[PDB]
Design a binder for these strands. Structure first.
Lengths: 82, 208, 150, 129, 84
RNA sequence: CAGACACCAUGGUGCACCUGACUCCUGAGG
RNA sequence: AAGACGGACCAGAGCGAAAGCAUUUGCCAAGAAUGUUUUCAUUAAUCAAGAACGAAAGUCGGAGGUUCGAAGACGAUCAGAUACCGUCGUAGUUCCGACCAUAAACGAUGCCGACUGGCGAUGCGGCGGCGUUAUUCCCAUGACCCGCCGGGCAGCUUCCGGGAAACCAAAGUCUUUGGGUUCCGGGGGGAGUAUGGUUGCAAAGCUGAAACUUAAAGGAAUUGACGGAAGGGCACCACCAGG
RNA sequence: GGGCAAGUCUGGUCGCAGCAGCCGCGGUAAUUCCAGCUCCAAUAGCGUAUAUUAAAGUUGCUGCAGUUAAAAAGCUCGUAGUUGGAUCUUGAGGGCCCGCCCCUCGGCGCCCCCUCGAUGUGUCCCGCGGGGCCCGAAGCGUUUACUUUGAAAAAAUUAGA
């Protein structure tokens, strides 16, 4: 949370989400991301360089999360048989 | 993705699926599993879409990969049919194994007679592994799980459509998972399938 | 919301977006105007004319052929019923209930029902009076209700 | 039936947003609803909307975002002569550093910062932040 | 719903199963049809939910029978809306 | 389930109680 | 013969504004739901006054009193019974025209609209199937099965959201406080009493005070103790069989 | 003693005298009394009674509660009263801003008069000054509430230079 032209107030900058556009606050439970490994393709065999999605308390308790992850993953690629 | 032709499935898988009785589902209507469904069999029963089962299995597998220690993924089954299944998975992939009773508190309890440190849980039915599923969301752990059309979807991140109760259905999915993770990172390598048969998994199958 | 009936449901059709229906044979102005004039001669209400035109002829409403509706045609011609069709049919029910009430003086239901129908007539009539479709010097009465329906 | 149309729309969005749902069907659809949505949209509080046209009265599908915290309605409307605006702003907004009070002025439906510059008051519709 | 969907062009089987005024674009699905039927020697236009019978000169009586829903028809018939 | 099933009223009192700092201090040597 | 009453079938099922409403059949008008490119073209939402209906008892005049039965009188049981319990039996139950206007008239939850969640039934209407059965030559019928859609009484399971909790998809969208409108409450007692008015033939109904009294009246959950409340056990300080 | 800041006081009393808004003390080892001592708070002031205000969202416009705690009329119709669906048009200059679109004046113009340049009771550039008529403009078309700018708007008070 900035003050003025871009002075830093603040204790830290929290994680956000894009499955419901709501911040992960402050020490909350059921808040974790999900590193899917990339594969380099064509020759196979995992190469880095994680794709990370941020999952909040809210989505998980409302049993959304399964579908959400696929929408997020597909939209930016890449998984075989899409 | 990976090398790519056999990751768009192949006949070999489609034969194994049909044999293991994966394809049939429940008769309860859906609102979170509904997308996955291929078509509905006459007078109830849903035919799951093998294409969807594939992609989810691969995304799951990929998440276990990019950890350089395979021990901190806990494979969990309390189902009888999947006790042998997870035991073989743990030999192969190098998972830390939980067959039979979970015994409440191993991701919780500072004072306990056992403690396990995972980073990702893989569950065979979260209405039988309900204790891990609840316990995991008290201590900030993501959980993949094998879900049918009447399993809870709350606190499950990535679901894999499948019957996943009884028979060879639980076995086969553990076999295919192990095969997949070994492809990306293992010693099957190069994104080609295992030389081990699914029959090493499955259930004990009463011995004559 | 309904304070004129104890219902909860619906009682109107859905209507289409378009100003042309059905667009494969909408006939001509001529045909349906003749038909309207002849039907209105017999003393038939706009409701009845609309029903028979819809189903038998390839018109649906006559609002989609020309901008006029059956009432508008009637009104401009000067050959029209002398009160709105709805108001007529309301008055007619209150007559019918009144006749039933004359027959039976123990029918408590009929007394309750009559009141409701009569109130409904008055609110509709008030609306017509304000907008000069009824004269304000006429008013609903037992007496005159009989005379209209006859 | 509906004696305000703003109040229904605002609630509808908020209740969607709570779920994580990214669609609503608001209706009856009016000129003021369009105008309120555009000002809201511009500041980034909601996403883009699409007006579907019917001969009933219209229906709008709003694709919303969770950049909003609350859009309240001031029903019944009150007069604001630019010296009750200050009173409202301290009362009903969490800071003076952000959030807009949205009014209807004779110089157009506008946010209260623009109102202050014009010095044209009017009737208060609602607010958001 | 899985509670995050947004549909801007909805499929015509989940919009065509619903009630007539509950549709997401509201026009009813009712139509006109031509009825040939053999004891009538003219092509009578009929309304799908006719209510009161359609009859014609060419038939004795055989054209429609009343039903509260879709009007009953007898022997050979056709339908084309056409264009609602 | 699918054997038997009755009168019976009355009666009083107090104190339950609230803060943290490990030595037997070893005591020939120390 | 008289008078009364319509079991089992009968259900978290239907209808009716509510009170209420189960023998058969016919007649009379009425209401909802549904289907509906029909009609009108804003006619609407909700409410002082005003008005319709209103179980039971009671009261006016008859019919009628089978059955049962407020009162009374009897037999028991009890320390006390005038009660419960047995018997005799009155008004009354039933029926008609008048009064009366209240009920825990209980879902203790104003009315109208919008929005926010899963699953399966069932009364009813409509629609759909290379579904079953059934009838006429097969049908169109109809009952059934599956799917779909409306409007009913409800249920189930849920960090959907609320609440003090019990509960509650509304008692949700309330400090991030504001859709419309109406009604009632402001600690507990005095008291629906006093007093004046009003309605009623009467019985009664409506409006409705104060002095004074007093720091608790109350709600909910929790934990104990206790029950001539329900399932249990264990012991010759209990019983049994007996000394 | 608690609320309440400052006595696990010393003597005396012992449910007595008193204390005590309220909660409660005192019935013999009274940190509440009655004195003494010490300490606290405010300090030329402080205590007390009482009206009113604040706290009090315990009158709730902003901003109340009504399943069970105090509280939805037996139910419906319904007039006043309150409230009410959708729907009509206004390119350049400079790096937004300005006028516009689907006759009493000013004045594009037309006609008049002293006439202004062809002219010096008077034209043919024009209504420029007075006119009439009549366009961009504008009463325009039918009203407003609202909001906006002005005036009219005691001094003291009050904010405040």
């Amino acid at each position: 949370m900035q003050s003025n032209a871009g002075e830093f107030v603040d204790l830290y900058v929290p994680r956000k989400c894009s499955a419901s556009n709501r911040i992960i606050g402050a020490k909350d439970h059921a808040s974790i991301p999900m590193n899917v490994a990339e594969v380099d393709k064509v020759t196979g065999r995992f190469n880095g360089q994680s794709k990370t999605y941020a999952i909040c308390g809210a989505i998980r308790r409302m049993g959304e999360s399964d579908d959400s992850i696929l929408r997020l993953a597909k939209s930016h690629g890449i998984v075989s048989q899409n | 993705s990976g090398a790519l032709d056999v990751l768009q499935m192949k006949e070999e898988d489609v034969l194994k699926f049909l044999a293991a009785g994966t394809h049939l589902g429940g008769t309860n209507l859906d609102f979170q599993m509904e997308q996955y469904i291929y078509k509905r069999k006459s007078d109830g029963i849903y035919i799951i879409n093998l294409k969807r089962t594939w992609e989810k299995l691969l995304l799951a597998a990929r998440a276990i990969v990019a950890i350089e220690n395979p021990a901190d993924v806990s494979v969990i089954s309390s189902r009888n049919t999947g006790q042998r299944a997870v035991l073989k998975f743990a030999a192969a992939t190098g998972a830390t194994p939980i067959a039979g009773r979970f015994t409440p508190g191993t991701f919780t309890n500072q004072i306990q007679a056992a403690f396990r440190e995972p980073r990702l849980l893989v569950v065979t039915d979260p209405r039988a592994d309900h204790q891990p599923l609840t316990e995991a969301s008290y201590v900030n752990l993501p959980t993949i799980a094998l879900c049918n059309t009447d399993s809870p979807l709350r606190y499950v991140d990535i679901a894999i459509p499948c019957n996943n109760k009884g028979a060879h259905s639980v076995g086969l999915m553990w076999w295919m998972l192990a095969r997949e993770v070994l492809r990306m990172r293992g010693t099957i390598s190069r994104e080609h399938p295992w030389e081990v048969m699914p029959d090493l998994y499955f259930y004990r199958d009463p011995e004559e | 919301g309904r304070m004129h009936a104890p219902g909860k449901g619906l009682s109107q059709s859905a209507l289409p977006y378009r100003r042309s229906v059905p667009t494969w044979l909408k006939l001509t102005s001529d045909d349906v105007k003749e038909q309207i004039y002849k039907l209105a001669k017999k003393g038939l209400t706009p409701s009845q004319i609309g029903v028979i035109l819809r189903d038998s002829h390839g018109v649906a409403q006559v609002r989609f052929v020309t901008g006029n509706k059956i009432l508008r045609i009637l009104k401009s011609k000067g050959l029209a019923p002398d009160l709105p069709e709805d108001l007529y049919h309301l008055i007619k029910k209150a007559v019918a209930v009144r006749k039933h009430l004359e027959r039976n003086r123990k029918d408590k239901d009929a007394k309750f029902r009559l009141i409701l129908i009569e109130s409904r007539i008055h609110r509709l009539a008030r609306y017509y009076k304000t907008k000069r479709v009824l004269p304000p010097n006429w008013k609903y009465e037992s007496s005159t209700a009989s005379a209209l329906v006859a | 039936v509906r004696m305000n149309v703003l109040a229904d729309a605002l609630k509808s969005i908020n209740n969607a947003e709570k779920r994580g749902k990214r669609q609503v069907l608001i209706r009856p659809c009016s000129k003021v609803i369009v105008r309120f949505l555009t000002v809201m949209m511009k500041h980034g509080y909601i996403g883009e909307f699409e007006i579907i046209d019917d001969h009933r009265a219209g229906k709008i599908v709003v694709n919303l975002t969770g950049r909003l915290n609350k859009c309240g309605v001031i029903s019944p409307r009150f007069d604001v002569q630019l010296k009750d605006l200050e009173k409202w702003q301290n009362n009903l907004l969490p800071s003076r550093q952000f959030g807009f009070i949205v009014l209807t002025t004779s110089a157009g439906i506008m946010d209260h910062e623009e109102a202050r510059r014009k010095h044209t008051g009017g009737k208060i519709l609602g607010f958001f932040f | 719903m899985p509670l995050a969907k947004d549909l801007l062009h909805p499929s015509p089987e989940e919009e065509k199963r619903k009630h007539k005024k509950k549709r997401l674009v509201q026009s009813p699905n009712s139509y006109f049809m031509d009825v040939k039927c053999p004891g009538c020697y003219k092509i009578t236009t009929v309304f799908s939910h006719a209510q009161t019978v359609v009859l014609c000169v060419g038939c004795s009586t055989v054209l429609c029978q009343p039903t509260g829903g879709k009007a009953r028809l007898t022997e050979g018939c056709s339908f084309r809306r056409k264009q609602h």
